[PDB]
Design a protein around this ligand. Structure first.
Ligand SMILES: [Zn+2]
Length: 278
């Protein structure tokens, strides 16, 4: 069987949807952990060196010049577009605020379901290239998975239609909602823009508190992969309740609602729309 390594649980889950029984799949970043900065364990280094295919997000999630995945593949003498593949290739890239330069991308493309489809098609193409005798399975599974994601994307495009503009604001700890905000017409705000920044100074909390006095949503949200303390402080100081945990940089643990890319996005759409409509 093809040996496949994925950098995190979101990419690994998309790969499972395409490949099912046919591959030997290893996922590096544990569920619930930050995928931006991680220290691979010896088993991760071994599996990466022995893999036939390595999938990573790209666009400044784990692949900055000094970032953990770049070091891993360079130490292993692996080559981009031969051994390892950025599943985000082909998306319309959004950058960090005020930026336009390579290396300053916003990585969170998968929160737009159109980009989840792009990721999945890229995964399927590279699995078919390296394991052509399972093409029938990969293509069949891809076609059904894409159809399912497209139906959810159509739902997402009208999910927030009944909510007034003066309370359409998704508030999370990390500024990970740019692609969702652009695709689905719901602006977003944050404590820290990206996880490599300082995660929750009193000044960052104060900046968000001041923003929430201008546009005041009925709910805040907190991601499954961050320390909740900063958002608990935002909630206490603003009086706006945390409505639900949501899934941004990780799927949920197995058996918990949201334990796949599809299920985490359905969860996010339901919980965010329900909380904002209060
Ligand atoms: Zn993130």
């Amino acid at each position: 069987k093809l040996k496949v390594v994925a950098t995190n649980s979101i990419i690994a889950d998309m790969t499972k949807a395409i490949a099912g029984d046919k591959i030997d799949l290893h996922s590096i970043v544990p569920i619930g952990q930050d995928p931006h900065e991680y220290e691979p364990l010896p088993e991760d280094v071994e599996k990466t060196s022995n893999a036939d295919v390595i999938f990573y997000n790209g666009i400044n999630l784990e692949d900055g010049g000094q970032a953990w995945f770049t070091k891993l593949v360079k130490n292993a003498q692996k080559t981009k577009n031969k051994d390892y593949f950025a599943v985000s290739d082909g998306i319309d890239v959004i950058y960090l605020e005020g930026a336009s330069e390579k290396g300053k991308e916003d990585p969170h493309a998968w929160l737009n379901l159109e980009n989840g489809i792009i990721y999945s098609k890229n995964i399927a193409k590279q699995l078919i290239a390296k394991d052509p005798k399972n093409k029938e399975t990969y293509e069949k599974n891809l076609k059904a998975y894409v159809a399912k994601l497209e139906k959810l994307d159509k739902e997402a495009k009208s999910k927030f239609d009944a909510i007034a503009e003066n309370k359409k604001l998704i508030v999370t700890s990390e500024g990970c909602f740019k692609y969702f905000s652009k695709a689905y017409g719901v602006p977003s705000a944050y404590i820290w823009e990206i996880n490599t920044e300082e995660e929750g100074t009193p000044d960052q909390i104060s900046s968000l508190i001041e923003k929430l006095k201008v546009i005041k949503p009925s709910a805040l949200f907190v991601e499954s992969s961050v320390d909740r303390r900063p958002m608990e402080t935002v909630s206490k100081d603003s009086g706006i309740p945390i409505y639900s945990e949501i899934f941004t940089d990780s799927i949920a643990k197995k058996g918990k609602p949201g334990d796949s890319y599809y299920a985490m996005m359905k969860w996010n759409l339901d919980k965010i729309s329900e909380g904002l409509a209060k």
